[PDB]
RNA sequence: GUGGGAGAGGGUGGUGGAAUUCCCGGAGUAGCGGUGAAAUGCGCAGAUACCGGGAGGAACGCCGAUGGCGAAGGCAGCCACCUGGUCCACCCGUGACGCUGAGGCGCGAAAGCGUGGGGAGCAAACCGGAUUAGAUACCCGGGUAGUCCACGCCCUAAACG
RNA sequence: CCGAGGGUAGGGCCCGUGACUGGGGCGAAGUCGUAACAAGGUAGCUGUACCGGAAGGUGCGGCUGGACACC
RNA sequence: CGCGGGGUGGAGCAGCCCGGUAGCUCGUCGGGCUCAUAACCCGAAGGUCGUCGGUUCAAAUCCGGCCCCCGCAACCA
RNA sequence: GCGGGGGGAACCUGGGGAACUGAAACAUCUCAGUACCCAGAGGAGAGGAAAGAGAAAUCGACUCCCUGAGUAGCGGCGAGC
RNA sequence: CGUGGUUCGUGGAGCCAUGGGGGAAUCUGGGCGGACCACCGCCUAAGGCUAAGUACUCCGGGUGACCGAUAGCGCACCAGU
RNA sequence: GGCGAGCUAGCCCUGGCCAGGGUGAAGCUGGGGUGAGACCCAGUGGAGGCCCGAACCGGUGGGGGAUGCAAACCCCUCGGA
RNA sequence: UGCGAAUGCCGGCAUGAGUAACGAUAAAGAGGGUGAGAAUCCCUCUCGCCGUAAGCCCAAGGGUUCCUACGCAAUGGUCGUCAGCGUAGGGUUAGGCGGGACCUAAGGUGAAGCCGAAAGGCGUAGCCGAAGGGCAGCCGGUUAAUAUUCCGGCCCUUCCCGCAGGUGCGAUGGGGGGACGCUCUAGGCUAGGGGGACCGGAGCCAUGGACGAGCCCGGCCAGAAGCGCAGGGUGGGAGGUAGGCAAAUCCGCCUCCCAACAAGCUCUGCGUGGUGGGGAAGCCCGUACGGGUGACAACCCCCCGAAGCCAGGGAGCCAAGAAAAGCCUCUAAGCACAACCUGCGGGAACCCGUACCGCAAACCGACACAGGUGGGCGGGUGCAAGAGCACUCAGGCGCGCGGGAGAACCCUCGCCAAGGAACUCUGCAAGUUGGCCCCGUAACUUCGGGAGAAGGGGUGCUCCCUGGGGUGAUGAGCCCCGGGGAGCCGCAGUGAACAGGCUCUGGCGACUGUUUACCAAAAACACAGCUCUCUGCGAACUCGUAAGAGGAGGUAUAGGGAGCGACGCUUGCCCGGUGCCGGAAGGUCAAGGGGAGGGGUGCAAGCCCCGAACCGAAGCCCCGGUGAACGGCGGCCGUAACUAUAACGGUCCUAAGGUAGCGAAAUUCCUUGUCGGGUAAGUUCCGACCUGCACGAAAAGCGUAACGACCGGAGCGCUGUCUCGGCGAGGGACCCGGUGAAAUUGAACUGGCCGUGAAGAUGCGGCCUACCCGUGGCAGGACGAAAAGACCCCGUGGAGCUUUACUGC
RNA sequence: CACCUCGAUGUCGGCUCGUCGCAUCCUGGGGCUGAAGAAGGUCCCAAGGGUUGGGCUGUUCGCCCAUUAAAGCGGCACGCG
């Protein structure tokens, strides 16, 4: 049956993208955290 | 008046469509005069602030002229009578002699050949527009300014009209379609006559769908909800209102008067009961 | 046919005043209403009675008759438009072209009915006061439908001379 | 082939009959009230409409087969 | 079994609750009015207060039991 | 023309600011001006030279440590602070 | 007047702060010493800056009656994988 | 305090899809009817949250599955279309 | 700092067990090859399975999986020599396809502005944003692998510079256009398909017959200008001009003049077109693959015919159907040497994508998972049609464990004597029926319906005659729709597959719709419709601290809230309480005004503190209204000339005491009420009565045609539901080879009875029975597994919900 | 009553399959009889076997139809998911 992951490469980048995160203080602090934790990738892949 | 239908289907039995014989145009409208428009009943923040709206037919917004007083004295020919789907009423296309084209809401009794003017000058005749101070007492009237130069807010709905009961100082006394009795400034324009397509009120939607076409989504009663949802909901096996009947938001929906008390507007209102 | 005539004859659009009710303002005080007599009701939160203003609906006083019109039901302030029947004088025209009329069709007071309006006064139902053994009545205070308009139905009658 | 008729299926009309139900006729002296006949004590009748144990009452319009004093 | 109210002239209700006193309407009786009956007027009669114990000076009235009456409740199962 | 912008583990000041919990229930009260969120600051930050203390004719800017002291008080005079 | 801060929870409630209303004076002026008044004292509001002593540990170093690969950081190993 | 409407619900903007058959509304034309009508019939016409039924959307009943092919499936049947 | 327990934590290893399974029942068999090794790789043949797909193409998404060489440890549910796996090399080519140096849509962002403790919220213009608008490439060949990309052929677009000819040029400004719905649909085309006795072609005569006007294969594709057919769009001239926020000659508007037509002008489609290019069976080798000839290939007639094209076509309807740029046109500055227009010519023409999978073993589902996933094309025959159904093209596949046996049992399926619902909560299930044509068709009805009512007849093949249609000629041929006659065979002609069982009668809901993703599809929601109510417009109301917004670019025939729920006939009485609505008086009423009087302290002038009367809102009280507002609509006793019963009376209470209708009900306890119907027999059902525990009128009352995967009752038809089972098929189950789990598990050397024991003993007592160990089976027991019982209580545990609980906001 | 079981002892009825008790429904054997015969009554022995089909209701039960030699009552976690 239909399931919850329906990949659409645009949606990934406009939702979880780097410019998303920067646009908003919630999201800048996600980057702050991801970075300070030493995350290799601050933000999701999409091609 | 009001086409009916044989019952070749359930709901074709009660359906009732307008007599469009008045309409001289069909698929127009004057392309120079109309933008578009959209909504959802949702508001700038994304939220439903009016319940049960959506879907229904695409529309182009006929731009229509509620200021007659900026053409004072130029005459106009009624060019067509056509179908506005943003209003109960009908809109007449009129060519001015400027060559300027404009929409007006179309009075009852307005044939399309005729001449129409607006201003203190102004014969008193169906279609003309004047300061209320120059319209003879007892005239029925529609498309009335509430305040001078601000546009017509009063009696624009298909079939509506209003009436001059007398004059006081700078103000004349009107009986609105509501029956309210009201003073409006002398300087407010109004056009003479009644709105027409008065047969409007007798259409019979006939099926759920005819409501959907108009953007009217199903309306679910408090009674049919749970108590999270609404002052009446629960018990079930039906239930009487169990309390003074209420809105979703808790206020009382029988008898309770919501007009604000100190509105400086009350100096100009005498009625409505 | 011509020339005339009387008329609330019918349909339409207008419109006038008297009155009732309601509201506003004045002035003004203790009752007003109602009946057989009373009570309910209304009234110092200022009624009734008086004056001024406005709103609105409905019916048309004197004329008015023991009268006129219409086939009947029916028709009554005034103005206009449109329109029917009818009478008299002339003796002009056609030349029996007539009378009736099962069925058909149409009209049909009041009440009632549908859909919109309108709603002053009145008033089924209903409520109250009184009366009475009782009083689901007659009288009194209220009062909705209705009474009015448009459209469409109903098709009855002591529709009687 | 037609064909008495048998069979299956669905109509129409007519008689009979049926818990129960509706009124109606009729049957000396049961119960309630008084509508009508005299202005019958609210003149009556009436089409219709609502109401009411019952007769009836009320509304609207109509019929007369109803009307020597008082303002 | 349970909880609340009740049991008063012939009928329907007051009075109990706050101790001492039994009242209202209808009925029934006697008399009028009427030819007569009702309507109506004037008059009277009528109850031990379910019952059994107690309290008190005194109990329809306060308490207990019994006998009935009306009502409410009996749920998770 | 000079400057600002953004980042920094924790630490600092400011603007805002909880609930569980405790009170053996719970509202005042507590947790707590904590957690958190926001702005700014720096290598520190804040504070700082008396319209101060507060009983002495005394002390002499501010910060931090010990002490005063679980004292003075505060407190559904409760838990507690 | 309405609140916050203080130990102060409306208390006899001052002090400091201030959202609202009213609204002065310049030494013979003003604040304060716990309502208020008198006396006696203290102090000079409504401009600003100010090292050091203090906080902290991303970082570097020294030292452990600190661990020794189920411990010690989550990660002794190309782990915030 | 933040992260989520790539599932799902609603709306918004812009596209797309709906074999085939059936039944036969108004209207229009003609004819009849009438004083003129209403109206009647025929042809035409092609309306409809109209009918049968694929695609598509469903999920009615029953069987199966039940450490499944599957954390909702399969088969027969069935609703809309 | 000592472990045995915490359904503890981490790891390791056991049991179950060589057990269940090995993932669609579309199906395999042999021969040859390869190799250490082969059911499983390669090739051949035969068989079988998809074919509106299980074929082909595109978009997502995925991200080297593509091609080839070498490999088989692992991955692959077995095997593997094989692979989507390991290693390694190679492979994606564009001015025209897609997207960007274009346009705008929702939305987003956002100079200006506005608002907000901070962070931030909003917002005009603008900007961003696409599967929409605009926009120039068609056919073939080529590689192991890419191709509208490379190559061949034939076309085209922009920009730059030049030349010529033309012209008031000139834009971000004005105007036109772009530019639009849904049904139905004309005429002409093409895609595609069928047939030909005609054209071209290797070859074949088998097994009885056939040397044939035989049989089998094929008989096209792309193509500028010009042209032809079919269509789209489309007036011309002047005069006036005040409108289109300047300007206009443009557009608008008025007047006059000629066109009425595509006449012309113009655009597109098709066709034809120089030219370019393909081109079968078969046979031969020779292939993962395809390669020669056949060939110098032929290359044409007929017919069927789109849903596609001409395209802004036409008609009708109402619910009334984007924008902006390209494009044209108008003028402003400004420049008129410039600029623009047209044609020609040369030059210039960037970035990204391009492999491969793509209904799936490569995407979403932890899996090579029976699930899910948008657009396109999807051939042939026959059955009325069709994308349906059976077979079949091209093309693709036999589903990555196999071999045997032929028990129980299970699943899926076939058939059955007599009976025919006796089954059972219920005909659940299965069966019947079944398409098309024709006859025929009731109650009732809102006059449409009900209807496919019901019930029947027809249904193949042959020969004969015969009517109209399309296309062609008015002809034949080819197709289409018929009509009549006479015969043939079988058990049977919708001969297989796809395709209603029907009738009667109740309850509920008007109807189509909607719903609990994943135990409820319904009598629930919604629904047209009716009523109340609010709301005069900066509306009421909703979201937001606000700004702002929705409402609505709406205006009382509108908009919000509430209830009721098509339609019919109707919806009674009570306003005491509560709510709402109205009331300028009165009462009480907080801050504030007031300051009679009192107080503290000063020598005092004073400073400070109380503070009565009185004035002082809303609210409350009070007065009234109000029912499609919350709601509520009685008790006891008596009475008729049998009896019963009580039209009638008495009395007590209420704000008023339930009208009509309906009633043992989706409501009736007693209850299986009583009576009637149906049945041989009826706690259900249907019709009645009325003693309504405990109906009743918009939480509507009573009805109602039509409708329903709703729930009840009855009949006919028909049946393996049943009497009552039998047989048969296949996939399991069994046996063999390969692979090999699971929950559970204190340890076990794990019998029966009668007792006993914490009360239900394999484990204790007595007695009985009993050689050791397994296989296939059944489920009585291990108080069997699973899930720290959901019911029940407990806890001063939690959460959702309500209110005239408290206290706040 | 509250003793095992609330870290689970699935609850009515049906069906299937039984097995046991006897306080015997039938058949066998008997005593008494107010037993003429036949046919009953009541009691004693006896558990070997037997003990129907159907309408209604979820029903157990029960009512009813048609038969019967008879249409037995109980236990087995109201035997047996
Ligand atoms: N035709 C009958 C009609 O209906 C009614 O008639 C019936 C009754 O009204 C009337 O009943 C009457 C009654 O009014 C009168 N006041 C009392 C009287 N005893 C009764 O009488 C009846 O009862 C007795 C039985 O006891 C019978 O024997 C007698 O025949 C009969 N009259 O008797 C009639 C039946 O017999 C009306 N009276 C009237 O409309 C008309 O007469
Ligand atoms: Mg789907
Ligand atoms: Mg790195
Ligand atoms: Mg937003
Ligand atoms: Mg739609
Ligand atoms: Mg609703
Ligand atoms: Mg609900
Ligand atoms: Mg919610
Ligand atoms: Mg609520
Ligand atoms: Mg409720
Ligand atoms: Mg209920
Ligand atoms: Mg006249
Ligand atoms: Mg006349
Ligand atoms: Mg003559
Ligand atoms: Mg009439
Ligand atoms: Mg009338
Ligand atoms: Mg009156
Ligand atoms: Mg008369
Ligand atoms: Mg015959
Ligand atoms: Mg016959
Ligand atoms: Mg009388
Ligand atoms: Mg009378
Ligand atoms: Mg009389
Ligand atoms: Mg009356
Ligand atoms: Mg006494
Ligand atoms: Mg910084
Ligand atoms: Mg702070
Ligand atoms: Mg606590
Ligand atoms: Mg608690
Ligand atoms: Mg410093
Ligand atoms: Mg500093
Ligand atoms: Mg400083
Ligand atoms: Mg503290
Ligand atoms: Mg404080
Ligand atoms: Mg203080
Ligand atoms: Mg001073
Ligand atoms: Mg101070
Ligand atoms: Mg001090
Ligand atoms: Mg002091
Ligand atoms: Mg000091
Ligand atoms: Mg050590
Ligand atoms: Mg060591
Ligand atoms: Mg470690
Ligand atoms: Mg080690
Ligand atoms: Mg670790
Ligand atoms: Mg979504
Ligand atoms: Mg969505
Ligand atoms: Mg398709
Ligand atoms: Mg179709
Ligand atoms: Mg059709
Ligand atoms: Mg159709
Ligand atoms: Mg349909
Ligand atoms: Mg299903
Ligand atoms: Mg379901
Ligand atoms: Mg269908
Ligand atoms: Mg120790
Ligand atoms: Mg231990
Ligand atoms: Mg085993
Ligand atoms: Mg096995
Ligand atoms: Mg397999
Ligand atoms: Mg298999
Ligand atoms: Mg096949
Ligand atoms: Mg096919
Ligand atoms: Mg991709
Ligand atoms: Mg490969
Ligand atoms: Mg392997
Ligand atoms: Mg590889
Ligand atoms: Mg761009
Ligand atoms: Mg460039
Ligand atoms: Mg743009
Ligand atoms: Mg924004
Ligand atoms: Mg695009
Ligand atoms: Mg595009
Ligand atoms: Mg392009
Ligand atoms: Mg090609
Ligand atoms: Mg490519
Ligand atoms: Mg120009
Ligand atoms: Mg433009
Ligand atoms: Mg041969
Ligand atoms: Mg062959
Ligand atoms: Mg061919
Ligand atoms: Mg060509
Ligand atoms: Mg050759
Ligand atoms: Mg068109
Ligand atoms: Mg699929
Ligand atoms: Mg596909
Ligand atoms: Mg694949
Ligand atoms: Mg597989
Ligand atoms: Mg799959
Ligand atoms: Mg699909
Ligand atoms: Mg077919
Ligand atoms: Mg198929
Ligand atoms: Mg059989
Ligand atoms: Mg049979
Ligand atoms: Mg069935
Ligand atoms: Mg069939
Ligand atoms: Mg049939
Ligand atoms: Mg044959
Ligand atoms: Mg069918
Ligand atoms: Mg029933
Ligand atoms: Mg329904
Ligand atoms: Mg449907
Ligand atoms: Mg629902
Ligand atoms: Mg569900
Ligand atoms: Mg359904
Ligand atoms: Mg607005
Ligand atoms: Mg708007
Ligand atoms: Mg409802
Ligand atoms: Mg209803
Ligand atoms: Mg009512
Ligand atoms: Mg009331
Ligand atoms: Mg009242
Ligand atoms: Mg009230
Ligand atoms: Mg007052
Ligand atoms: Mg007040
Ligand atoms: Mg009152
Ligand atoms: Mg009543
Ligand atoms: Mg009953
Ligand atoms: Mg019954
Ligand atoms: Mg009941
Ligand atoms: Mg019944
Ligand atoms: Mg009810
Ligand atoms: Mg009601
Ligand atoms: Mg009913
Ligand atoms: Mg019905
Ligand atoms: Mg349905
Ligand atoms: Mg259904
Ligand atoms: Mg069987
Ligand atoms: Mg077998
Ligand atoms: Mg042993
Ligand atoms: Mg034992
Ligand atoms: Mg022992
Ligand atoms: Mg075994
Ligand atoms: Mg077992
Ligand atoms: Mg088993
Ligand atoms: Mg537990
Ligand atoms: Mg407690
Ligand atoms: Mg609690
Ligand atoms: Mg116990
Ligand atoms: Mg005990
Ligand atoms: Mg338990
Ligand atoms: Mg256990
Ligand atoms: Mg267990
Ligand atoms: Mg015995
Ligand atoms: Mg014997
Ligand atoms: Mg025995
Ligand atoms: Mg049953
Ligand atoms: Mg029973
Ligand atoms: Mg049991
Ligand atoms: Mg079970």
């Amino acid at each position: 049956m239909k399931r919850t992951w329906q990949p659409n490469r645009r949606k990934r980048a406009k939702t979880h993208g780097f410019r998303a995160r920067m646009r908003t203080p919630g999201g800048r602090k996600v980057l702050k955290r991801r970075r300070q934790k030493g995350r290799w990738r601050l933000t999701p892949a999409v091609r | 008046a009001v086409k009916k239908f044989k019952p070749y289907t359930p709901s074709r039995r009660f359906m009732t469509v307008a007599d469009f014989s008045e309409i001289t145009k069909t698929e127009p409208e004057k392309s120079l005069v109309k933008p578009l428009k959209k909504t959802g009943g949702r508001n700038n923040q994304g939220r439903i602030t009016v319940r049960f709206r959506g879907g229904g037919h695409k529309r182009l917004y006929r731009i229509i002229d509620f200021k007659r007083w900026d053409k004072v004295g130029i005459p106009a020919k009624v060019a067509a009578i056509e179908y506005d789907p943003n209003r109960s009423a009908r809109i007449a296309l009129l060519h001015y002699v400027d060559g300027e084209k404009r929409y007006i809401i179309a009075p009852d009794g307005l044939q399309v050949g005729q001449q129409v003017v607006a201003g203190p000058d102004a014969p008193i005749q169906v279609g003309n527009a004047l300061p209320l101070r120059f319209i003879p007492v007892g005239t029925v009237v529609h498309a009335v300014e509430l305040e001078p130069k601000k546009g017509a807010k009063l009696a624009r709905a298909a079939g509506t009209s209003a009436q001059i009961q007398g004059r006081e100082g700078d103000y004349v006394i009107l009986r609105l379609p509501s029956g309210e009795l009201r003073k409006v400034h002398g300087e407010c324009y109004a056009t003479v006559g009644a709105v027409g397509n008065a047969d409007h009120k007798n259409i019979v939607l006939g099926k759920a769908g005819r409501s959907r076409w108009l953007g009217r989504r199903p309306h679910v009663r408090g009674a049919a909800m749970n108590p999270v949802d609404h002052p009446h909901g629960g018990g079930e096996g039906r239930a009487p209102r169990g309390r003074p009947p209420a809105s979703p938001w808790g206020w009382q929906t029988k008898g309770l008067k919501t007009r604000k008390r100190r509105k400086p507007s009350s100096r100009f209102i005498i009625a409505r009961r």
Side-chain angles (χ1 to χ4, degrees), chain A residues 1-45, chain B residues 1-272:
Chain A
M1 32 170 292
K2 196 173 183 200
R3 301 221 164 277
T4 90
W5 191 228
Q6 295 315 122
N8 158 299
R9 304 179 136 113
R10 189 198 269 221
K11 175 71 182 304
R12 201 148 173 74
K14 323 203 67 215
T15 296
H16 316 315
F18 178 102
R19 316 183 47 75
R21 306 228 166 282
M22 291 292 304
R23 206 133 310 185
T24 196
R28 306 199 279 284
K29 308 201 57 174
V30 187
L31 291 170
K32 253 200 49 49
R33 287 178 247 115
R34 299 208 53 109
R35 237 193 280 268
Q36 164 194 355
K37 185 209 198 71
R39 287 302 203 173
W40 283 11
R41 332 180 266 274
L42 291 211
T43 203
Chain B
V2 280
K3 298 321 178 227
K4 316 180 183 58
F5 300 73
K6 297 190 154 215
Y8 35 108
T9 73
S11 60
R12 224 65 213 185
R13 170 175 254 126
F14 312 102
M15 260 177 90
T16 280
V17 194
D19 161 273
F20 293 122
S21 59
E22 190 41 78
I23 305 284
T24 58
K25 251 286 191 59
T26 71
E27 174 206 15
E29 304 238 282
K30 231 59 169 305
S31 181
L32 57 150
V33 280
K34 65 212 76 37
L36 38 68
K37 65 63 201 187
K38 60 159 317 270
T39 204
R42 321 233 189 161
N43 78 321
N44 62 7
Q45 50 208 229
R47 297 302 195 81
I48 307 173
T49 60
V50 155
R51 298 151 80 217
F52 316 118
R53 303 237 174 178
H57 212 261
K58 192 174 197 56
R59 287 181 185 165
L60 270 310
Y61 167 64
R62 287 63 159 153
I63 167 60
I64 82 161
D65 178 30
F66 286 118
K67 315 186 163 171
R68 297 277 286 290
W69 74 85
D70 59 347
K71 278 314 201 192
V72 174
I74 304 165
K77 180 174 296 177
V78 173
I81 275 182
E82 60 196 304
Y83 175 95
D84 186 355
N86 310 115
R87 44 190 27 85
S88 48
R90 301 287 181 256
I91 55 170
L93 213 180
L94 40 68
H95 307 334
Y96 282 73
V97 285
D98 287 279
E100 187 174 345
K101 300 179 161 199
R102 301 258 263 247
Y103 275 123
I104 198 49
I105 68 102
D108 202 294
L110 191 288
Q111 328 85 326
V112 50
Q114 72 173 88
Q115 210 76 194
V116 280
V117 57
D121 47 284
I124 315 280
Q125 68 150 241
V126 161
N128 293 15
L130 298 77
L132 278 170
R133 56 183 330 173
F134 305 122
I135 301 189
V137 153
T139 305
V140 312
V141 153
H142 67 287
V144 190
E145 312 222 271
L146 202 50
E147 276 176 288
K149 303 306 159 273
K150 277 175 168 191
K153 323 219 88 49
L154 263 44
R156 335 193 318 197
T160 39
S161 34
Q163 183 155 286
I164 305 287
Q165 301 312 81
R167 286 167 191 110
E168 190 164 22
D170 290 332
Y171 274 98
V172 314
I173 283 71
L174 283 192
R175 174 180 52 75
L176 311 179
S178 76
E180 171 178 306
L181 253 69
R182 181 74 149 134
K183 310 181 190 178
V184 191
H185 201 291
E187 291 300 321
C188 297
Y189 267 46
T191 88
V192 47
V195 164
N197 177 31
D199 216 20
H200 181 205
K201 76 209 299 177
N202 297 347
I203 43 61
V204 166
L205 273 278
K207 67 202 286 179
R210 206 123 169 270
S211 270
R212 310 298 306 278
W213 306 346
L214 305 174
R216 307 200 208 242
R217 310 204 34 247
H219 189 334
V220 49
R221 295 161 296 118
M225 314 189 165
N226 286 292
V228 285
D229 299 317
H230 192 258
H232 332 108
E236 294 293 27
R238 317 234 181 80
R241 283 82 206 186
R243 46 179 295 191
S247 84
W249 314 284
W251 40 271
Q252 311 200 339
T253 181
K254 304 302 208 292
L256 187 277
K257 267 144 80 175
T258 59
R259 163 177 234 266
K260 168 168 152 207
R261 296 240 308 270
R262 308 198 316 316
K263 233 179 107 180
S265 163
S266 302
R267 280 189 65 200
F268 315 132
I269 301 187
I270 39 181
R272 207 253 275 189

